[model samples]
Target: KVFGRCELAAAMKRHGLDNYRGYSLGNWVCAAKFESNFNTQATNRNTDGSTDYGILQINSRWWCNDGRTPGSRNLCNIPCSALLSSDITASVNCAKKIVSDGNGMNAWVAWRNRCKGTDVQAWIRGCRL
Candidate 1:
């Protein structure tokens, strides 16, 4: 909802996501599309009674404080709403931390199912680099 493929890439480039952990911006693009359709305000409830938030769709159990959920680790030190906004710096930091805690970009199930082993370069094919 906030950016076209190129625009998102440009923004991520500015934020250093283009080479975070040596993963391409395309990886983030693919995961974001499958997770939130690029909508910053996107929210999806999981079957386990938690919610996925923002463009990265971070989980409530580990990253954010959605008041409705108790004992939230809130490791990001911000509300889930922060991730739902166009100002995603905090969310980006959180996302980077998350990948650090897992097996590369494969931490996101969406990336595995929709982007893994695929021609992800096409995700940012359009617009100016």
Candidate 2:
């Protein structure tokens, strides 16, 4: 599923991403925009061999078990395949766990490079949530 900006914001808000741990819904939307372009089936393979999965781009090396990453922590306890679905339940849960860490959204290089210190609210503009 490739989401419109407002659609992504609404979905993220429904999952309690709005201001979760001091990060705004816009921040979540912004990160998703840059990371996966709001595509549910998006995937990115790192040179290190881990893959980022889903709209939030949870990584195989830490949050998901792809069986390819040699030392996967599977910290989110979900198969990487689960994150590719349009449902987003597993992806949102895994993303919450990622941000619960001290790095927060900084864990995503896309977020740091594009969303951090920028007008993230633009990502959620006109989204009534």
Candidate 3:
């Protein structure tokens, strides 16, 4: 999807995120930036034979079932390709479920390896969302 940072932020807000489930708005926004750079079509294969999908770079191994990523448990019960669209409710909702599992954003190594503890204002700088 083509999201201006502010648009993305606003969409998140409208979607009832921005700080839902104990994750800060910065954490959510920063992951979108670092994970997929806010591009919904973004897809990349990890070394563990899992493929990440959409704005949050959600992994197929546990999150979604797509034939391309075999043995996917698809806990999200959505197709991986379904996440590649402009609309992001499914992805965000899936992300909520992920965090609800109690690991929070740790599901993302990017969040662990980089975004966590880093200043995240730049992800939403001047966005006014």
Instruction: Give the Cα lDDT of each candidate.
Output: 0.82, 0.92, 0.83
TM-score of 1: 0.92
TM-score of 3: 0.91
Rank list by TM-score: 2, 1, 3
Instruction: Give me the runs in candidate 2 sitting further than 4 Å from their true place.
Output: none
Provide backbone clash counts, one per model.
Answer: 1, 0, 1
Model 1, 2-35: lDDT tens digits are: 6666777777777888868978889988888898
Task: Give the clashing pairs for model 1.
Answer: 1-38
Q: Which model scores highest in TM-score? A: 2
Q: What is the per-residue lDDT of model 2 for residues 1-129, given as tens digits with 9 covering 90 to 100?
A: 898899989989999999988999999999998999999899999988999999988899899999999987899999999999989889999999999988999998899999999998888999887
Better of 1 and 2 by TM-score: 2
Of the candidates numbered 1 and 3, which has the greater lDDT value?
3
| lDDT (10s digit) by residue, model 3, range 1-129 | 767777888787778777788776777888888788889899999888889999888989999987877776899999988778799998888988898898988887787777888876666678777
Report RMSD for candidate 2. Answer: 0.7
Measured by lDDT, the strongest candidate is: 2
